């Protein structure tokens, strides 16, 4: 009964955990894409 619900909720919790991790790594990647266009834009301003 409630142990099937618990055994299910654990799995969906783990799944959401994986999703959160992927979103973190993507936010980081986009942070790099920003810092790059920022340095590039700055060096182009200097040029």
């Amino acid at each position: 009964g409630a142990s099937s619900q618990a055994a299910c909720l654990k799995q969906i919790l783990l799944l959401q955990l994986d999703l959160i991790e992927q979103q973190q790594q993507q936010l980081q990647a986009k942070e790099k894409e920003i810092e790059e266009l920022k340095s590039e834009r700055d060096t182009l301003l200097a040029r």
Partner: protein, 95 residues
């Protein structure tokens, strides 16, 4: 490129199922209205069925996703699994 429609709909659906208020006589029909749209958001543009191994474009925000059998996007995969487990929990409990 991440999927906005899919994640947003997963949030809405999960929030609806997990906050099922036994006392709101309109809750079940709400979950029932939202569930097919969440199902649509994760479907294959070739098959029509739920995405098997998702692949997405990186230059646009196309919202168009296709199977590997038909650039792999991990978010889409995790979300397909999310849909499966949410469906499993919906089948297990009675609302």
């Amino acid at each position: 490129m991440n999927p906005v429609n899919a994640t947003a709909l997963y949030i809405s659906a999960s929030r609806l199922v997990l906050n099922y208020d036994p006392g709101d006589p309109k809750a079940f029909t709400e979950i029932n209205r939202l569930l097919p749209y969440f199902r649509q958001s994760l479907s294959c543009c070739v098959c029509g069925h739920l995405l098997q191994d998702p692949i997405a474009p990186t230059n646009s925000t196309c919202q168009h996703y296709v199977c590997k059998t038909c650039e792999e996007n991990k978010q889409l995969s995790i979300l397909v699994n999310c849909y499966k487990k949410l469906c499993e929990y919906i089948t297990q409990t009675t609302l």
